[PDB]
């Protein structure tokens, strides 16, 4: 029932961390979370939002001055310049957010695939990749096996014999 | 046996617009726009603003008798004027170069 | 007797977001004016509860 979800859709039981494994085993069921990729994603997102927000400053002025019935040319000029600025700013903001909302999603959906490719490359051939999103080991190993495969210390030669 | 990979997902129902698809739902978001006003004037630093109710700048300078100044004033940050002022100049007249006088009295200490 | 960073004829403003759409006339330190109805940024994933 632990269907992999990085293609179908995310799970619900995970709370801490965005990307996480599912360290299923005998009498060892229970979710987890990768301790490195989430931190990098958090740093990236914070940097993007900070760069977007804190790049502007404002001063003491705004639209609105009074004129009599003889200065109509100045009133027309003031309206023209105010409308020009009021158009430029909206266009810039709209295009900025519309462009960023796609790049961030692409980055978030590429990170998971990169993690899956890494965990696949680590397990050279002992993994019988179903294709639904995750593997199924041939040899039997305890929770230390899952801890190693998360950490990145799993090796072929020691467990090679039992695979065949 | 199966070390399966997934990602977090919850029931948060929000909507953002991308350059490819429209009206897509995401787990978190941050809003860059606000539409909220307290509804009443506050103190913009300084000390306090003036309250020229039922009066006008052209009537406070000359001291219209039925405006009675503003009791007493010493300093202010900005002026507040009713959009439809009754008491201006009681004696009919024509204030010369009145428009620039508002600029001169916009910011004083 | 409240205090605020800037003000508008319709009232005071308490937020510090880099945009606003209530009114262009302002005195003080407050963001620009934008006619767009609503805009927001995304800092998450795709929400498919499977």
């Amino acid at each position: 029932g632990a269907i992999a979800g990085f293609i179908e859709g995310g799970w619900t039981g995970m709370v801490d961390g965005w990307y996480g494994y599912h360290h299923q085993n005998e009498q060892g069921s229970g979710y987890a979370a990768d301790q490195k990729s989430t931190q990098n994603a958090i740093n990236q997102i914070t940097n993007k939002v900070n760069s977007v927000i804190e790049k502007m400053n404002t001063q003491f002025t705004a639209v609105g001055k009074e004129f009599n019935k003889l200065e109509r040319r100045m009133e027309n000029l003031n309206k023209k310049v105010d409308d020009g600025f009021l158009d430029i700013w909206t266009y810039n903001a709209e295009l900025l957010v519309l462009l960023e909302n796609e790049r961030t999603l692409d980055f978030h959906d590429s990170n998971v695939k990169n993690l899956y490719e890494k965990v696949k490359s680590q397990l050279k051939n002992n993994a019988k990749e179903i294709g639904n999103g995750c593997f199924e080991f041939y040899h039997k190993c305890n929770n230390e096996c899952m801890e190693s495969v998360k950490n990145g210390t799993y090796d072929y030669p020691k467990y090679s014999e039992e695979s065949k | 046996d199966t070390i399966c990979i997934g990602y977090h997902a919850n029931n948060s129902t929000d909507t953002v617009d991308t350059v490819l698809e429209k009206n897509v739902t995401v787990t978190h978001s941050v809003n860059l726009l606000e539409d909220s006003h307290n509804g009443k004037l506050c103190l913009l630093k300084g000390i306090a603003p003036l309250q020229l109710g039922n009066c006008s700048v052209a009537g406070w300078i000359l001291g219209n008798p039925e405006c009675e100044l503003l009791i007493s004033k010493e300093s202010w940050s900005y002026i507040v004027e009713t959009p439809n002022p009754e008491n201006g100049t009681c004696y009919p007249g024509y204030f010369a170069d009145y428009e620039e006088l508002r600029e001169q009295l916009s910011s004083v200490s | 007797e409240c205090d605020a960073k800037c003000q508008t004829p319709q009232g005071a403003i308490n937020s510090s977001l880099p945009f606003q759409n209530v009114h262009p006339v302002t005195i003080g330190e407050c963001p620009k004016y934008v006619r767009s109805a609503k805009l927001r940024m995304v800092t998450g994933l795709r929400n498919i509860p499977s």
Partner: antibody
Amino acid sequence: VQLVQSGAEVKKPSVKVSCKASGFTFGRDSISWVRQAPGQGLEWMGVIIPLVGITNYAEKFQGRVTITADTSTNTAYMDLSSLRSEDTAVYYCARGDSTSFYHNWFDVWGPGVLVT
Amino acid sequence: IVMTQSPRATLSCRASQSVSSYLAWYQQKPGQAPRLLVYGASTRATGIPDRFSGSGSGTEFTLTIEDVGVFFCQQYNIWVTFGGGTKV
């Protein structure tokens, strides 16, 4: 920088404490909340990065405490529900670090708010 | 993770699980919010008169030494948990 709070919150047996940023504009922060029992050591309650909205709660206190953020007013609340008679304790408002979201040490602390 | 306290001042906080160099020592006067003294058990922090310091890693660390009250030892290698209060 001193993190101001709401004030006394004495009520009969929902509760909404509040925190606010002062002196420093809201940025890379990891506001965390610690509950000091009257005669026991400090416990841990949650952690939030308001600039992104990523929440994370302790192991025991998942089902009750729901820390939420508010970017507009630079605040962070609780929505502690189903209050008991054994939760009477002071609730601080401690800052932290954002580049070390899984290894956080509290640097700045708030004055204190009573809850009973 | 459970911790145990220590009943020219030397205080120690036994750790029931491996911690390496991830602690920080908290000192507070009665009635006020605590303040951070040192973190990493070796890297001195700001606001310190150099009167007190700590040492050790992967084992209980000795905190060698106004400074009257209660001291707290905190670990941040698996979530965060606090130890017992010092009796000084």
